[model samples]
Target chain A: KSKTEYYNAWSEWERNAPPGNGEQREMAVSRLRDCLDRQAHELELNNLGLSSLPELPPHLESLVASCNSLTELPELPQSLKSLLVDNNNLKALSDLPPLLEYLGVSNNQLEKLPELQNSSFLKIIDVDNNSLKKLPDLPPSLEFIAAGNNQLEELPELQNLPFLTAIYADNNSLKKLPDLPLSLESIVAGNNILEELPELQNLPFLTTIYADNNLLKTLPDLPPSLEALNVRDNYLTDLPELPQSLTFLDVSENIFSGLSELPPNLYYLNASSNEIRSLCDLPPSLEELNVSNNKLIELPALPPRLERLIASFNHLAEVPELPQNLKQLHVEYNPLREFPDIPESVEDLRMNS
Target chain B: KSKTEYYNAWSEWERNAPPGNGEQREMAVSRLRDCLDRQAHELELNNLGLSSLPELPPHLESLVASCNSLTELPELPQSLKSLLVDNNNLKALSDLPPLLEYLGVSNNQLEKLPELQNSSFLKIIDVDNNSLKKLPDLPPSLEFIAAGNNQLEELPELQNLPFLTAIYADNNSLKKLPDLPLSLESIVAGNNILEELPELQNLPFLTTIYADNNLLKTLPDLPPSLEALNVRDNYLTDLPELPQSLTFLDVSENIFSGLSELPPNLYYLNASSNEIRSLCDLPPSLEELNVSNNKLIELPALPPRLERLIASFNHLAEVPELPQNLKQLHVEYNPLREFPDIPESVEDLRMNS
Candidate 1:
């Protein structure tokens, strides 16, 4: 057949396919009739113009039809183990094959997810950037789920997916987060309307969090395995006492009045543009401090190992008596009537009236 | 009583004091004469049992008798310049002689600085941490002055001091800043109740400013020569359009809701712990951007040439698709539902869910 004719036939099939039905369906019969061969073990027709799937070949083990215009799924071959039909216009899902091991239907128009109650061999599901409002029941053997950039208001029904490790659900309308699976190690859920976070005191394997731009007034209890925290642009007036394992913290643009104390193991901290009026509470392990445009009336007695200090546009009337190990000092545009007694150990001093 | 007694007295005087004052000051002249003759350029009698200065020979130049129980400054020879009498138990400085160049009388119980109209050649003064409510008239050749940690509410009269350059006056009760001298370059005046910064824009040669921990609601228009600005821990909600020449900006811990847009040429920016929602408007030429621990729902498309992005504990749901030129991406403790499609050009992707 000519390419045009082939395309026309595929388009017609795509327009008429029915989605979200059980295994015994008409589209499955059509797919099986037109594409199945007696010797074929796998079928891969991804990015085609088909709307529905035909029945699987009797002995087929794998099927892939991603990036198509199909509206429904077809019945699978009894022996099928892997199925992938992503980037389609599918809106709903119905019964799935029992023996399926891997499924990926990402970047589609799916609004409702079907339950995967008995899929004992399923391992991975990547359904990102869909219109899913809620998640379906997951099998216990599932290991990964990518359902980010959706309209989900709450977590999907995933009570027992113990093998799940990673989840990416940012840019949603979720106001509260669900208790994460114990096996989960990573999550990215920034840009939500959550006002308060549930206590996350026991996630030992959890390491990173990107929770900027929320209405959070206080930080939840942190996990011991956390290494970095970026809580920029929240309503938190002060940081909860951080864990000793935290090495990096970006707590800028919050309501913190002063950080009179800090953990000794902290390496990097950016607490600029707050109401901190003094610097008496800095820890000795700090390498860099950016306390600019605050209400500071005096320079904090810095530790000897400090490398950089950026404190400008405050109510300071004198230069701070910095330690000998300071490398850079940026103090400008204050009410300063005198200059600091700079030690000979300073490398750069960017100070102005 | 006898000549032998007189000779013993002379020997004792010669052993301890230097010489040169006339007969009219005979009683106070002999002791310093022996000390000056002994080439004591560095005389430190801090917290000494004596209450007055001994007669000095002409060679004495440096005197540091601070924290002493003396009541007044002793008469000095013309060769003196550097003097430090801080933390003394005196209530006034009415007996200080002229011809000094550098002086530090801090932590004294005086109510006002002593009149130094006769000390026209003085260059440096440090009178901080004292009870002085006001400063006396200064010499025109003063190079450095530090009058902070005091109760003074306004600046000293400095209109005629043409060669003055640096000043530090933090931890005072001043509410506003004075117009700076044209030759001034450095100042540190943080930790006051200042509400506005009005006279700082005209300083073209200003390089650094430290005004953190004040009541400032917004940053003033800064000098173009500013290299770094630290406005941490304040009430500022948003940053004004910044100068293109700024290399570092630290405005952390404030009330800003959104700060993705930044100057293209900025090398460092820290906006951690605020209410910022998205990374939508970052500048294309940024080298470092930190937005940790906020409510960000999604990251804007990263610049192709970005070097570092530190965003931890935010509300992100997915790992963002990174660019080819990215060097480091730090994303931790988010509800991320999916792994970001990492590009081959990235050198490191440090993330935790």
Candidate 2:
């Protein structure tokens, strides 16, 4: 009976840590170590004032030390599978365990990545907001990499990571894009100095790309899976034919004098603030279009699916006929002397004739 | 009752002429002529091919037919108001009756003021867009005078009509805006070599001004009630702050490097395709803000009530946390790494992050 009672008490202590002594101060580090020693699989030390981590004990499967002031990575136990040390003051990383599958070291001061060649199980690496000037050789198992807000001038060698699916590399000085792995689906490379787009015809799964605020003179050949493309604020006088899958496009604030035609599948388009004097043959699928603040004397043909049309502040002498599905129309500040023929489908019309 | 029904049927037939019947067409024109003739107003044929004149006809106000291909203004039988026949190819004014209020005959080949001006109320003279740019004007009651859009670059001497509201001297090579009557709300002095904005600040109700595609570097101080200002495709770098009453502003395709902080109450602002880098301190009441395709790294803070924020293709690294009241947030193709921390109160957060 005494031995059975002792086993039961031990099992209860293992399930819940021993009740704190009334007079004892909270031992945060020791409590974490005790929890790990009792086979706790997950440990979260977020928003704690921990300056550095004690060496992790062997049983921790995941550990989160985010929003801390740790200056360096503590030696991690090999049993650790997931580690997040984000928003810390760490300036360099001397070593990382090879078994980590998910890692988030973002918003740190690490100036360079130590060799990560053997981190085969690592899938996600969010090292954004770091001071890293170059990327370490990515392991072949990497799936997602967010290296934004770094000082890197070019993409690190990612030739080995064929399974890479997403990359966020904005706000860098990259002048060129590296050949993407075939599995890449999403890329955000805005605010770079890329003058030409890399050939992306091989990336069959690529869907969304944001290459705005670059020096692109023309749209590069795009993949058919692209649904949204933003090339605004560039020097392109004309865009190539849009892929059929594109749904949202913004060519506003560019030098596109006019478009010969719009893609048939577009849902939202903003060609406002451009030099387009005439628009011809808009696609019937467009729902919202803004052609305001241009030199248009007359309207191009509109689609029946248009819901909102903003054509203000132009040289138009008469309002264009409203479409059957129109809901909101803004034709103010033109030279219109007579009200345009409005369709009964229009709900809100703000015309200042 | 049979005669009355027959007359009503005949009237309906006169209004809608048969499709291929020339005789019915003449009958409809004759009926329209008879309706105008029953009213005591004179008609001058000017610039024909007008499909319908619902505002004119039986109230034949003042008709001036000059340099037009119209056969004639329908004759008035009751008490003709006024008739001005100048450079038209009319062979005769023999059918005119003399209850006229005003008349003018300048360079028509038959060359006579005609007995119509001798009627009781002859008041104004306008022989413009024609061959004889000079006028021999001598009606003591002539209150308005216009000799423009012709060979004469200077105004001819005219006398003493006190109620002139407008004078059009556009499409001439005149280097300056001509002096005008005090009640003028608009002046069409466009298509001239005028290099500077006219000092029309004294015109109290002057609202609509169009000085576009011009070489003027600066605009004159506009009237206080100015509602719309369009300076599209110009060489001006910047425009002065418009009046608060302005609802539409278009400064597109210009050489402006940066726009001065826009009026806080603007409804539409299009500074597209410029070299503008920063749009600082926007008014919190903006409805639609399009700073796309500029060198903007991020959008200036918007008013909490903004409905559409179309800022795609800029150099933005991350989107600002949009207000909860925002309806559409268009930040596609920007270098956004993670989705902005949008408040849960927002309804639609359509971002390509």
Candidate 3:
């Protein structure tokens, strides 16, 4: 539309906008007129103290109207492709168009989402920080779903999705997860009551998983492509053979007394607050290891690339030869009787009794 | 662009292609054939250990060829819209296509970039972890530039780029920055030898500024929209009146003995390792405050919302009434003769003399 035409449309709308306060209404009207005049395909009506939105432009493709007082949304046009209405008071959503790709309605008061029927083009749905007890049926083309911080007890079956990549279902009450797709790469289901994870060995591209603060007793066979795994604050006592591609592994606050063979590529291992007694052969690539609050009486040979060691609150009596490049050593509260020569590279040495 | 036609095209190319080592070359070729068979517009050639890229599909729009060993690139297709060739050995690039919108060439050995002539569609250019001594002329449509970890001494004039928003030029040798456009919202120019910053009061959307580990003796007037400012490890003696919108302020390791009035919305303040003698009235919203390693003899009244207070290594003789919600208090080295009644909510108290 031409500038004069949009200006006249604004003038016509203002005449029938119902006489109202001018503080924020006037500001919103001005911004709306400007966006119309520019013929912008995207509208950013965030933080405008708006209680209601006017009829949108016909050619708009994306609309972000977060941080408002909106209770309901208008019937969206078919040309809209992306809609983000986060941090609002929306209790329900309008019908979604078939051409929509992204829908973000996080931080709302929604109890349930609208049906996603025949949404073949939808890819991303971010409904985090809502009061949703369950999610609507997702489309097959969906790639990412951020449904964290909700009251969800279970998720819909996800094995049929061919392109699902990442699922963030943290801080929920889910007791189990459905079978994930083979194309999944990352999953964040932390702060749940999950007891066991689905088999991950089939997922060839899975890289990271965060399942902390759960009741997990065992993990399934990990994928060879996994790089980072955080299962802290769980009940696992043992783990499978470490993958050769693993680099970061955090199993702290568990009841494990030992671990499997250390991977050659593992660099960070945090097994603190466990019942560990002995040590295994450290990998040459290990740079930081924390085994504090354990029952270890002696230490193992440090790695060539070890830089930081936190073995405090243990029963250790002596230390091994330190690596030349070690930078930090925190062995406080240990009953030490003898000590090795501290490396010159050690800058932060805390060995107080 | 049919599937069978694209498959025949790949089959024909493979018949006449030079065949030698079958390690990474075979992998790259296999991926190429699959992309062709699908007639995909996006190609992922990352981590293929490729020394060179094959001719891309004619309809390809995006190519992510990072983590390779390429020394140069082929002539990009004119239809290419996004190109990421990071973590390679490319010394130079071929002429960029006019339709390019995003260019990522980080972690390379490039000393210079190609001319960005008439780049009307270019929006983002990421050249971090390179050796570029200077940047080329940027397009007016450029919105974000990630040129950190370079040897750049200066940047091109940016005041004329009306759409430039964020610039990440940290870890360079820049002594000064150019006048920035008002559209800028974030800047990370740390780990340089910068002595001053550009005037920022005119930027209505500037939010976060990280100019730490520099030689800045003073800062320009900050914009009112700023939320976080990290000017640590500098020679700053004082700061200007903080805007009320600021929430995080880190001025540690400076020569400041006092500070101006803090904004009311500031929640985290780290002013440690300074020559500070006293503190002004803190913001009521402050939760975590670190004033350690200073010459402070007395502190102002504690705010009610403070939770973690790190006043260690100071010359404090007495402490005032502690807040009821205090959680962690680290006042180990202070030579205190008397102390305030400890709150019941204090959890981690370290007041050893």
Which structure among the candidates has the greatest DockQ?
1
The reply for model 3, stretches above 4 Å from the true place, is: A1-35, A199-207, A223-225, A324-333, A336-351, B1-353
Identify the leading candidate in terms of TM-score: 3
Give the range where candidate 1 chain A is weakest over 10 consecutive residues by summed lDDT.
Answer: A21-30
Mark the regions of model 1 whose C-alpha exceeds 4 Å error after superposition: A1-153, A156-213, A216-233, A236-353, B1-41, B44-59, B66-73, B86-92, B107-111, B116-118, B157-160, B260-265, B279-292, B296-353
Ranking by DockQ: 1, 2, 3
* Residue A292, model 2: Cα distance from true site in angstroms: 4.0
lDDT of 2: 0.65
Clashes of each: 159, 10, 0
lDDT of 1 by residue, A127-155 (tens): 78788888777788988777776778988
- Candidate 2 local lDDT, B1-353, one digit each (tens): 24345345445545554354333333334444544545435444444322222223545556655444333444443444666656555433453445555555444433222443244355555544444333343344545445444434454332132454445554444545544444555444543445676675666655555555444557777777666666655556667657777766777557566787665567777776566667778777777777665666666777777777777766677777677777766777565656777665556545652
Residue B239 lDDT (model 1): 62
Each prediction's DockQ against the real complex: 0.26, 0.10, 0.06
State the TM-score of the second chain for every model. 0.70, 0.57, 0.87
DockQ of 1: 0.26
lDDT of 3 at A254: 95
Query: Looking at model 2, what is the TM-score of chain A?
Result: 0.80
